[PDB]
């Protein structure tokens, strides 16, 4: 079915590949060629995860884990029962994410709007690819990718962080955390501001963007405006993710694996301004 206003927009055309073969909707969802491909990749991946779990000890959802290959295989294809399932789930996942971004591009073209959403999703895709492809390749073996498990990839994060002393002292990581915390702050501020203007105090009319500008001024000191806030939010989230990716690229390929991020900062303490 359609929203009460949707029929105007469900027009033909705007696809990238395939013509009108897949130019249709299934309920709410637009399909396109990339929608078929995305469901294909997602389902092959989920079935490989289920099979890897069937080979494993437990079905416990928290303990399910698809582990990367042993370091003995380096950057080569591992046997399916000794890490190859991880590589194939990774290929299926990157395929799913890419075809999902492309389906979003097709929807953008069909609606006649900008491509900001697929572009922004490409940043999360890039962070994932950094984690499972770029960083283990730079470090020489697929064993550096994280295991696909709800609580085993947390163990991977813990071990990876503690292998560099304390990961908090990673500078790009500090920048990324600052960006994430500011993104959460700005999301709360923006949501609350719009909800305050739309749902005012009792007996009050719905407030205007001028009131929003005034209260934003009184809080943050100045005003960015209705388009500035969405720009700033996009920028904050994207830069958080980009600096997370940089953070991961510089630890292991650049700073040695058994290195120390706390000790890297001694370059400042050891400046000739104050060292001797």
């Amino acid at each position: 079915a359609m929203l009460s206003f949707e029929k105007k927009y469900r027009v033909r055309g705007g696809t990238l590949i395939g013509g009108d073969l897949f130019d249709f909707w299934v309920g709410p969802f637009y399909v396109g060629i990339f929608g078929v491909m995305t469901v294909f990749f997602a389902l092959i991946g989920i079935a490989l995860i289920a099979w890897n779990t069937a080979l494993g000890p437990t079905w416990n959802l928290w303990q399910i884990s698809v582990n990367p290959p042993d370091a003995k295989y380096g950057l080569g294809f591992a046997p399916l029962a000794e890490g190859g399932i991880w590589q194939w789930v990774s290929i299926c996942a990157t395929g799913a994410f890419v075809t999902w971004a492309l389906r979003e591009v097709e929807i953008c073209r069909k609606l006649g709007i900008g491509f900001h959403v697929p572009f922004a999703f490409s940043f999360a895709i890039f962070a994932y690819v950094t984690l499972v492809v770029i960083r283990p390749v730079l470090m020489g073996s697929w064993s550096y990718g994280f295991p696909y498990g709800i609580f085993t990839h947390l163990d991977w994060v813990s071990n990876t962080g503690y292998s560099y002393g304390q990961f908090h002292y990673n500078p790009a990581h500090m920048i990324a955390i600052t960006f994430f915390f500011t993104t959460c702050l700005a999301l709360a501020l923006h949501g609350g501001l719009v909800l305050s203007a739309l749902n005012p105090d009792r007996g009050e009319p719905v407030k205007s963007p001028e009131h929003e500008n005034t209260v934003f001024r009184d809080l943050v000191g100045y005003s960015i405006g209705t388009i500035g806030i969405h720009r700033l939010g996009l920028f904050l989230a994207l830069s958080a993710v980009f600096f997370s990716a940089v953070c991961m690229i510089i630890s292991g390929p650049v700073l040695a694996e058994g290195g120390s991020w706390p000790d890297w900062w001694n370059w400042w303490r050891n400046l000739p301004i104050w060292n001797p």
């Binding site: 079915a1 929203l3 009460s4 206003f5 469900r10 027009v11 249709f24 006649g112 007996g203 719905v206």
Partner: protein, 251 residues
């Protein structure tokens, strides 16, 4: 439960949260259904009973406006339900084909909503989108280029007209529209700033959505120094139609 029991305060708190969060997701998904409902059933579906979904849409919400006025959402009068479209195939989910001219019909990327035919009044009960000749005290800040005077050119390289005036938003100092004296019919049409490259690439401002002659067909505003919400959607929709239906033979 007791120190040795399998049940403990942490997981009880977690299940309390799971209940609260399921309730909150239901509430949020319910708030999401204040526009666009009930659903329009497609081909091969019985239309006797309404399609709504598992969180049913809430009761219509009533907003109070400044001048004692009142707006109840959903805005069902904005839907434009029946338009100039025909199904490209009899099965459900098939796309539609514009029967006529999608620039005039307002279909596809060229669709608009039946908004109120009245301008936005902002705060001092005056239209906020006005020509600079009507908003005294504001100025284009010559730090950036000045659009006025530059003749606007289509997408196929044909000059469409000349930029005559810059329309700005009050209380949010921002240029929203360029007024364009059309080529040779003595008519002024609006051009949304995001649909124009006002940079002076060579000498002029360029719009790649429609071609040069199509500037004659841009929906004109009824007044001269104020534009209504309906005309705003109509103009932005005329320009959005070109993103799919113009492609001005530039191959």
């Amino acid at each position: 439960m007791q120190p040795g029991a399998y049940l403990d305060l942490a997981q009880v708190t977690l299940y309390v949260f799971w209940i609260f969060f399921a309730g909150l997701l239901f509430y949020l998904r319910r708030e999401d259904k204040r526009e666009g409902y009930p659903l329009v059933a497609d081909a091969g579906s019985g239309t006797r009973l309404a399609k709504i979904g598992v969180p049913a849409p809430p009761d219509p919400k009533t907003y109070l406006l400044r001048g004692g006025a009142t707006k109840t959402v959903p805005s069902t009068s904005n839907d434009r339900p029946n338009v100039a479209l025909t199904p490209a195939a009899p099965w459900p989910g098939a796309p539609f084909v514009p029967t006529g001219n999608p620039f005039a019909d307002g279909v596809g990327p060229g669709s608009y909503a039946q908004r109120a035919d009245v301008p936005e009044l902002g705060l001092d009960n005056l239209p906020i989108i006005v020509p600079l000749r009507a908003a005294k005290g504001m100025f284009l800040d010559p730090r950036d280029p000045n659009p006025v005077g530059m003749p606007v050119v289509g997408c196929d390289g044909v000059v469409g007209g000349t930029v005559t005036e810059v329309w700005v938003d009050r209380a949010e100092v921002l240029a929203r529209y360029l007024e364009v004296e059309v080529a040779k019919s003595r008519k002024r049409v609006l051009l949304p700033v995001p649909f124009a490259l006002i940079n002076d690439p060579f000498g002029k401002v360029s719009v790649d959505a429609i071609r040069g002659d199509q500037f004659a067909g841009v929906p004109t505003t009824s007044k001269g120094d104020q534009v209504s919400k309906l005309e705003e959607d109509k103009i932005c929709a005329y320009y959005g139609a070109g993103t799919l239906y113009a492609t001005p033979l530039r191959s």
